[PDB]
Design an enzyme around this catalytic site. Structure first.
Site: not given
Ligand SMILES: [Zn+2]
Ligand SMILES: [Zn+2]
Ligand SMILES: [Zn+2]
Ligand SMILES: [Zn+2]
Ligand SMILES: [Zn+2]
Ligand SMILES: [Zn+2]
Lengths: 153, 153
Positions: A46, A48, A63, A71, A80, A83, A120, A143
């Protein structure tokens, strides 16, 4: 031709390098590189919102969502900007990344430069997990590593 | 209106957090934070062109110089956009950073977001060192710590 780069680091074994290339000013962005130290399988991937690494990845915010959508996955209309779906690690723990995306950009309102790229713990369920959180975050867990996306030569 | 942040880290124990705030795009940028682990004295303080830390601070390229000028100090007309002078460390190794700058920006083609902030081994001589390098880099020695400048909340 605009280029960007991101070094992914965290508290554990996960690390990587991701490159971005956009040939034309509102054209598709190529995303390529490698991430190592992962568990075999899918890992959410992602952009962020904030390029705030002051508390590692903890600090990166939600995000990146400049268009106030829900999402999803990168092939969805309802997504998003940030994404980018999942990357896939093999049994050696390496994910070779290869993405083309036409929603992210390296300029303007969809611009991801100066934002945080995060990999992730778990798979992002792409908005198809069967709870409320699926439509917000994708349920991809901790994360593991992140970095700020920088301008490249 | 606009805010940015940067975590400075080294190959040694030089650690900092630097904040940027710009109330309007036609205004100065306030730069504040702290850096620890430094030797007492002056340390050069630059925005380098690329937000590329894939090989550490070397990847960051030259001084950010969108206007094709020569090196100076932040008070000079003749400077690079990235020429923020020196920070000052005390005998405890701490530099408390407090700068206002009218040349860097958090938008437009003097924008520093996605670029690399670097603190140096030695003093930047501000263009007043007496050799050709002084007019290009300021002779500030090694890159002790750096990070990519990110968008903040
Ligand atoms: Zn983490
Ligand atoms: Zn998202
Ligand atoms: Zn994320
Ligand atoms: Zn420098
Ligand atoms: Zn300079
Ligand atoms: Zn150095």
């Amino acid at each position: 031709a605009t280029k960007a780069v991101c070094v992914l680091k965290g508290d554990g074994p996960v690390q990587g390098i991701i490159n971005f290339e956009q040939k034309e000013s509102n054209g598709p962005v190529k995303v390529w590189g490698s991430i190592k130290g992962l568990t075999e399988g899918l890992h959410g991937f992602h952009v962020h919102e904030f390029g705030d690494n002051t508390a590692g990845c903890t600090s990166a915010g939600p995000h990146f969502n400049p268009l106030s959508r829900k999402h999803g996955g990168p092939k969805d209309e309802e997504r998003h900007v940030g994404d980018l779906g999942n990357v896939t690690a093999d049994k050696d723990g390496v994910a070779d990344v290869s993405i083309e995306d036409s929603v992210i950009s390296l300029s303007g309102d969809h611009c991801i430069i100066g934002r945080t790229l995060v990999v992730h713990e778990k798979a992002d369920d792409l908005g198809k997990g069967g709870n409320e959180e699926s439509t917000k975050t994708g349920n991809a867990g901790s994360r593991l590593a992140c970095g700020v996306i920088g301008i490249a030569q």
